[PDB]
Design a protein around this ligand. Sequence first.
Ligand SMILES: Nc1ncnc2c1ncn2[C@@H]1O[C@H](COP(=O)(O)OP(=O)(O)OP(=O)(O)O)[C@@H](O)[C@H]1O
Ligand SMILES: Nc1ncnc2c1ncn2[C@@H]1O[C@H](COP(=O)(O)OP(=O)(O)O)[C@@H](O)[C@H]1O
Ligand SMILES: [Mg+2]
Ligand SMILES: [Mg+2]
Lengths: 365, 52, 52, 105, 177, 281, 210, 70, 277
Amino acid sequence: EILVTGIKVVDLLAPYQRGGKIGLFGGAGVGKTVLIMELINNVAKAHGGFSVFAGVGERTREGNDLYREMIESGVIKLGAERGNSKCTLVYGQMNEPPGARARVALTGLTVAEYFRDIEGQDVLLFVDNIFRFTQANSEVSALLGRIPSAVGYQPTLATDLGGLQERITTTTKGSITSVQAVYVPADDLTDPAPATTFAHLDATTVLSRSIAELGIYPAVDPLDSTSRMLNPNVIGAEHYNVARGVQKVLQDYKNLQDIIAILGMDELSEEDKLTVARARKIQRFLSQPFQVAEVFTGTPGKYVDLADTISGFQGVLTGKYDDLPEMAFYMVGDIKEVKEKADKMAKDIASRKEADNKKVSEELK
Amino acid sequence: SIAELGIYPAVDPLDSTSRMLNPNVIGAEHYNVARGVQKVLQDYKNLQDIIA
Amino acid sequence: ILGMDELSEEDKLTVARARKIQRFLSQPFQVAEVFTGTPGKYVDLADTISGF
Amino acid sequence: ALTGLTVAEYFRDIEGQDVLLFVDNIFRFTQANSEVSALLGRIPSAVGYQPTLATDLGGLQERITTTTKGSITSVQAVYVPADDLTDPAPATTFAHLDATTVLSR
Amino acid sequence: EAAAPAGPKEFTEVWNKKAPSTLIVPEFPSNYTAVKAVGEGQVHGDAFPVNFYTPHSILSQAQKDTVVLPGVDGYFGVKASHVPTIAQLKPGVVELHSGAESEKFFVSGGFAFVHPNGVTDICVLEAATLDQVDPAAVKSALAAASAAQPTDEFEQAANRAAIELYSALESAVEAKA
Amino acid sequence: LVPIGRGQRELIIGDRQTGKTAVAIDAIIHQKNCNEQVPKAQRVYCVYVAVGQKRSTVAQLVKLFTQTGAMRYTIMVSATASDAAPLQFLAPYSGCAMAEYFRDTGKHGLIIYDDLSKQSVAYRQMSLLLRRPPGREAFPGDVFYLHSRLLERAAKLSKELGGGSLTAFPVIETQAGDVSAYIATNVISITDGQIFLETELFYKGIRPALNVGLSVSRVGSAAQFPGMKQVAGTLKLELAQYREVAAFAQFGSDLDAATQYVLERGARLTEMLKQKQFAPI
Amino acid sequence: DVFYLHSRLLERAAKLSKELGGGSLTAFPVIETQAGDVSAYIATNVISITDGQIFLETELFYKGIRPALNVGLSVSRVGSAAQFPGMKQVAGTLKLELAQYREVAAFAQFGSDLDAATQYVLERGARLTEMLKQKQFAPIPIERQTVAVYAATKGFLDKVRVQDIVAAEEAVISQVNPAVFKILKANGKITPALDAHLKAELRKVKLPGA
Amino acid sequence: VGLSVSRVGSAAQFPGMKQVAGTLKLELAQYREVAAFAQFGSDLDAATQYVLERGARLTEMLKQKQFAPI
Amino acid sequence: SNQAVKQRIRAIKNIGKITKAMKMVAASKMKNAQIAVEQSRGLVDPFVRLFGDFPAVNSNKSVVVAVTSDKGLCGGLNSNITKYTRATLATTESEGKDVVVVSIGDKGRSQLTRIESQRYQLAIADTYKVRVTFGQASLIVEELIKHNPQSYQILFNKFRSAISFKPTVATILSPDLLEKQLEDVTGNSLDAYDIEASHERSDVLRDLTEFHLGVTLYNAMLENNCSEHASRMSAMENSTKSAGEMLGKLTLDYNRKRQATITTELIEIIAGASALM
Ligand SMILES: Nc1ncnc2c1ncn2[C@@H]1O[C@H](COP(=O)(O)OP(=O)(O)OP(=O)(O)O)[C@@H](O)[C@H]1O
Ligand SMILES: Nc1ncnc2c1ncn2[C@@H]1O[C@H](COP(=O)(O)OP(=O)(O)O)[C@@H](O)[C@H]1O
Ligand SMILES: [Mg+2]
Ligand SMILES: [Mg+2]
């Protein structure tokens, strides 16, 4: 069953499973901590179960930020009301020696597995940088006298990670919805620590660096993120055909980008210009503001419902919104708000100045 | 690339080299046809950059 | 592509100024004068700045 | 190249002069020191240089300096392998270089 | 009789009401010629401006003192303050005199306008000087054009145009100095 | 395009999430549909070896095979990701031994080794921990022999030996379409055909994302349906004419208006080869 | 463990809590990059450790824009909402007018067609780029820095083309009354009392582009 | 010819060949940027053509048959 | 995957020499067509001072001709006058008139159908293949007088310099269908001239505006052809930069992969040696 996250590119193209394993793949600064704090903000309050945040080898400043922001959110309650808390934190952050970072994911699961097995309920496990589990075993493995494997990792990378990931599952007694950030080293998705993790996940959300340099946030690669929930018997045929149609015009636009760079858009067929016009529009429409990114972007964040996501991208595929400019789709919630933003863009191009005086800038009043 | 076009046997006509391709071995009317065929196929590959 | 006398007189003023700067960076060397005939020129720093 | 340093360091420290030192092909200094690390059984670094590449260069290049006695100025020829400025032998060399003089055809 | 006050200046103001505001006005061929017809001047006494043109060449644009034009009524001559004229020309010789020296172009037909400001604008298609015509093959095709007249009414005109062109071309090689 | 005879090993190679299992699952599901219509002698008993996968992924497959009814003919040999590296190295050979029961007694088998690339990583783990000295990408020397030992057991036997067969489908994951990798190049040399699945063809809409110019069947049309041997030879050639005329009209330079006919018909033909998942025809 | 080399080091740069004294340590690691490749190993390690980056582009450094701050890539999310309140008022427009300037210069740098609305952006964008470039070993106080950007994101500098904007800045910061730097320092932000006082002082400064 | 060099250079050239091969290598050097534009023969620049045709006169000159040195 | 990046440097280096050849192919074709576009500029001048210039007339029937290129590496030249087509084809209709849209050049039929396909009736192509001549521009004009409108509209790019191509609308009124009807204000502007024709003034103006049609058509497809070579020259300059910027990013990417595979093969060799020693 689907997990509605309120994120447009997630809920459309790679939708999350409610008891499944979710991986956010990232390359150092592309946005997989902002995305994982947004899922804590959107999913983990309407979930109604316990959460475990295992911080494995990430910043200690971020551990203090989440801990303090959970106290003012009432997710963590201090003092005599501690039992009304919904989250427990396990932290093995990046100042720890490599033995502590190699095992702190295991003690985060043990807290999550008790709520699944004994308490019998639904847990949310958020593991920030499960790559650091693999990297900490790789710092150790040199000194355990092992012949190193490919790029320089442990010979036991797949079974070390496999033995940990196979514990993070939904069983017949309880559920664990697991969101894990996966760092990719030197932006290399063929690196064996990202490459081994891909098989362990029901939904992989791959965040790209080139998508982030075009200002699109969340920097989700729409043609590299994948769910097993994108299946017409699971999400319905109306949802499925929009996601596959969105991916089809984004792929055919990617096939054009070699010519658009050299020859320009003047050499395109006008059948192909309608592709580039539409695929530039949905590329901006996949971005959205986050309620955790408003504190540094200024823009308030928009939770977009699944029905507003599907109908909005279906309109851009059929052609109902070819009127609007491509910057009206950028950082807006749903298709009601691109029309709200296109009206503002048109209005501004007319009214820009004539603020000389008789405002509050009088030198005596 | 010769096999993907359907030419079978997919012999690269330029990359195939023999030591019997001297004029004092196979005669001049076999050597010049072979060196003539390879010249027309090499020129076409230098034009196929600009045809495509 | 276009022509020498095509472009503006100021863009020709640079071309006349650059070509006599590009020439003026040359210098005859004192160690090369045993096979070139032209005597060598040690050029001082203030004479280089004020000359340019 | 250290025998060339030592002759130029006498003129700097005893004669008190402004010495020129020409290290003809500083890349072949790197290349020779990379061979003696490979023959001494050391594990080669990135692209294949010695692990001590920045201290094999920096040991030589830091004796070329200005002291209170005199100076050594080094005009050293630079080869760029595979026309790759990001190769670790020119990239480590260019951290020391205070000027480049490019001679062109 | 004045239903449409048109012009280049009027087209700018109305086109800003129907086109997008991004586009600036298209240019017009009035923006590339500085010489007009009713604009007073441009005679300067003796020598008047003669614009003798072809589609493929500008054969003259400096001033002359008289132009012998081969009109369809007959050869007329233009002096400086000539009457305004729209003259359809026969195949004949345009004579451009500057003074003692004169250059003689044989043209194929095509109009010649004398504008009210004294500007002559000869407008022909093929304007060969007689130096590059040979007098041999002119009657070699004229004798053929004097023979081949079928009942084709389109070739009724095209042979008539063939005959009158060479016949004026016969008579205008004979009297050369 | 790439038809498969009985006793032929065929590689399903492609990147991640390109539909390699879906080609393999549809071969298993279709055998159930065919086993209800044929006599008892020519029925295909599938074995699916799942090496290094999730246990949830395997429980989703036995749920699909029970719901379709394909589980009556299927053995599911499961060496998941938490199993020991010698259990995942050895699971292709144990599944092939179960599948060779049907080959050796006159019946027909179908073995699917989903990620032989994950068997080689588990075999690299034991080799490097038994201190065998590593080779390319730290693999052992005998990793060609690891897969040629296994895939040469897929045979079509003589009528003296029963006439049984075993058809193998190794699955190999590439990294970025990099078929030049060490384990991928070993298995392309071992298997007869190859079904190359592409990522950009997958998102263009063409799924099953079969690269028709890179996909071979070395058995060829000797072991295909005679009702399609005469029909798909037209389809193989018209798609071959479709490819180069789509490379030039990608630019938009000029039109011949006779190469536009082969660009129109092959676009129907590319659209013809599309198929929904879990519904074999 | 070359990640742990740097991560265990830069983690010591912290702001301590008040029971530990309230002290702080702020770090500036420097990473040299080969040919602008930010996706190298050690570069991406320290990006995963530190809180922001200051990217210094080689191409902006060759154009004389010094400090060659790659504005589209340089981040500080922990330091934002910890900055000068007066600068936070005027730099929201500065980051935005530079955000449009990169976006409009992405469309058409060569003269296909120039809108009057986009040549306002290239006129204001080149105004603010020359505003931000400063010379070495002379750091500016934050109150002289707020006023100079107040004089640029608003009007007060559109007369000067692009060239004398460096000379217009000391024309601004020396000719305004030096009391206006004292109220902006001591309040921290631009009060509406100081707002139109500073509009008044910026109309009686004499600009070198005339 | 662009990649084949000789650091000894023309100090060990046959004189007489040094007179005429010094301008051979120049006319071939100008030809090398003008080469691979020779598929534009219908489209021509007529000074680019002179280095283009003479450049092909000289590469056809330097061909040889083996085991017969000159 | 170190040969896929090496074969892309094969592509972009051949493109960056194709597009620099087409830059100077179009540059030499711009200069020998400038010696034909300046000679042809003379003959359009007497007909615009005899008949004037009247773009916005309320014609009953119009033929609008947007003359474009045949080959299409022009760089948005054939689209800017298709854009300037409807900018004048919506402007001059104040009464609901007939309009026949014509295109000269093979890149015009593919773009005028996108706006007006119900008024598009003629397609002239293959014009610039050998050269542009007046007899050819006469035959194009005689096919335009089979339809007889009251006005003609010619839309083309005026080759001003190698940089600027300001488009032109050149208008020709039918001989007394509107032409004398626009001069006759408090008399006539045409009655100053003494007609020396064989037949009537209304008959010589029939001869004179077909000749005015064929002249400004011959200039249009000669101004446009020289404007096409000068926009292909600016287009093929912008693509050699784009194929040099792409080649520079590929060579940085290739050198990074070249350094990385030398490190990778060496770590494989030392690991195999340390397992034996
Ligand atoms: N023919 C098809 N039509 C529609 N959807 C398909 C088809 N094949 C696969 N898919 C969808 O694509 C996704 C990827 O398919 P699949 O799991 O078969 O890929 P894979 O090669 O097995 O990947 P991996 O083993 O790396 O996870 C699946 O979720 C499936 O639902
Ligand atoms: N959704 C987003 N909206 C706006 N900015 C973002 C978003 N995601 C990332 N960023 C920017 O990119 C940076 C990436 O930070 P973070 O998410 O911590 O990266 P990492 O993936 O390395 O953990 C953030 O500091 C922020 O500036
Ligand atoms: Mg993070
Ligand atoms: Mg699979």
